[PDB]
Amino acid sequence: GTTRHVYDVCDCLDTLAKLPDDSVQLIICDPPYNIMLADWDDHMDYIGWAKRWLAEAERVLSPTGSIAIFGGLQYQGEAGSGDLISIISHMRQNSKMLLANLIIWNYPNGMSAQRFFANRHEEIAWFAKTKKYFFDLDAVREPYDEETKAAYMKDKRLNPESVEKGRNPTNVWRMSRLNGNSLERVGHPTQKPAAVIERLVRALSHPGSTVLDFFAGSGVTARVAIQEGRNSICTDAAPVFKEYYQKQLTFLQRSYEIVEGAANFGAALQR
Ligand SMILES: Nc1ncnc2c1ncn2[C@@H]1O[C@H](CSCC[C@H](N)C(=O)O)[C@@H](O)[C@H]1O
Ligand SMILES: [Cl-]
Ligand SMILES: [Cl-]
């Protein structure tokens, strides 16, 4: 009943290259949306660079696996950059994966704007490797209060089972981002709130399966994986990632084993 979690500082392609085909159940992907100066030696645009890990991501996913890709739809056209649409368009043309849902993360607060509608959303593209993708809706249903539940149980037109299990969360999630006073905050500039990752982990992966994140950033995926009983592999190219990861652990003050080093990826792949 003990889960395994491996972490290390690596480039995404180097991590993927060490993972065998169909060995991962879920991938959390919140990638940078611009290439680096040196990348111009081999590419002419963002997708040219991104196509490599997107292909590798699909390769390591199991037949029942899925990948959630975070991104926006505000790309302006700057060379070397792109957004979630650049990725989706590429996938429609070159991948057999299915777009099972385009989730809208609608957050409450943000900056104001005088010349346009203030931005209050970012997206999550959920891609499934095949039609046999795993999905656990009941694990993420939102229960009605005892009052609403009662009013529905009296309505013979409605199914009692559905009422008791709760409502489908829908593909529009109203969840707030982390603020400067959040207890989760480890220092990463774009740290994602555990709440959003949790819903993905619960709905798109089963207990004891492997969750992979090669742009781990703050290491939030490992914390969620540990909490939900999943195994995990988290890597990020930034040396500071190790610090964030260790910090995530302190939040966990349960049976799990932490292992450093890409050479040990296997520990987290074992079912
Ligand atoms: N080649 C690479 N391999 C692995 N990780 C990389 C990488 N290039 C960047 N990263 C890491 O990926 C993470 C991206 S955070 C991006 C958040 C959000 N998508 C946004 O655009 O604001 C960072 O932690 C960064 O260190
Ligand atoms: Cl959708
Ligand atoms: Cl993060």
Curated annotation (Swiss-Prot):
Which family does the record claim for this protein?
Belongs to the N(4)/N(6)-methyltransferase family.
Q: Which UniProt keywords apply?
A: DNA-binding, Methyltransferase, Restriction system, S-adenosyl-L-methionine, Transferase
Any single biological process term in GO? methylation
An example Gene Ontology molecular-function term: N-methyltransferase activity
Record field: temperature dependence: Optimum temperature is 37 degrees Celsius. It has about 60% activity at 30 degrees Celsius, the optimal growth temperature for this bacteria.
**Activity regulation details:** Strongly inhibited by N-ethylmaleimide, inactivated by MgCl(2) or MgSO(4).
Q: A Pfam family this protein belongs to?
A: N6_N4_Mtase
**Which cysteine pairs are covalently linked by disulfides here?**
none
Give the enzyme's main class according to its UniProt record, as a single word: transferase
pH effect on activity, per entry: Optimum pH is 7.5.
Q: What is this protein called?
A: Type II methyltransferase M.RsrI
Chemical reaction(s) catalysed: a 2'-deoxyadenosine in DNA + S-adenosyl-L-methionine = an N(6)-methyl-2'-deoxyadenosine in DNA + S-adenosyl-L-homocysteine + H(+)
- From what superkingdom does this record's organism come? Bacteria
Keyword flag Transferase: yes
